[PDB]
Design a protein around this ligand. Structure first.
Ligand SMILES: [Zn+2]
Ligand SMILES: [Zn+2]
Ligand SMILES: [Zn+2]
Ligand SMILES: [Zn+2]
Ligand SMILES: [Zn+2]
Length: 143
DNA sequence: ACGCAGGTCCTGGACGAAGC
DNA sequence: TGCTTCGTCCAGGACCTGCG
């Protein structure tokens, strides 16, 4: 109030041109925090520090039940639900429940029947890119 | 067999919260 | 306060595993 500068990518408003220029980095990547190891860029320095653990192998979030360690606290939180049998994610179509939110999301796709991954060698179609990768290894073994 | 699909956890963008 | 840094959620994906 008032804001006269607009981003031509997401439409967000800004009161000063310097504010728009700083925000525009998220679309172009220019001058974003850049990892010195791999030179990929991230939205802020905290996301870069998280990414640094991919190079060091540091896993600072340890499960006190089994002793395994994880790179992110969210992953530890998801892992703890396995020990406690906590399955809060359920498919609304068939009722199958999961402790992992991605396992639930991946399962629900099967009710659509879509198989968008087609083997370039024989044309066999798969709902999962994983199954296509493993399938192509059979062609490599046959050849 | 091997297609199928669930188990598991790593990676990072999204975005409001907290820091300074 | 306003820009920076953080915590966290969440989506996606890589690799693993057993069933029928
Ligand atoms: Zn924008
Ligand atoms: Zn890096
Ligand atoms: Zn554990
Ligand atoms: Zn279902
Ligand atoms: Zn094939």
């Amino acid at each position: 109030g008032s804001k006269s500068f607009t981003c031509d990518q997401c439409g967000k408003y800004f009161s000063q041109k310097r504010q728009l220029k700083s925000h525009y980095r998220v679309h172009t990547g220019h001058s974003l925090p850049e990892c010195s190891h791999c030179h990929r860029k991230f939205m802020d320095v905290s996301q870069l520090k998280k990414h640094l653990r991919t190079h060091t192998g540091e896993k600072p979030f340890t499960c006190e039940i089994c002793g395994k360690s994880f790179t992110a606290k969210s992953s530890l939180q998801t892992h703890i639900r396995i020990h406690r049998g906590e399955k809060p994610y359920s498919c609304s179509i068939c009722g199958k429940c999961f402790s992992d939110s991605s396992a639930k999301r991946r399962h629900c796709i099967l009710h659509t029947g879509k198989k968008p991954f087609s083997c370039p060698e024989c044309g066999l179609q798969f709902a999962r890119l994983d199954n296509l990768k493993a399938h192509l290894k059979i062609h490599s073994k046959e050849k």
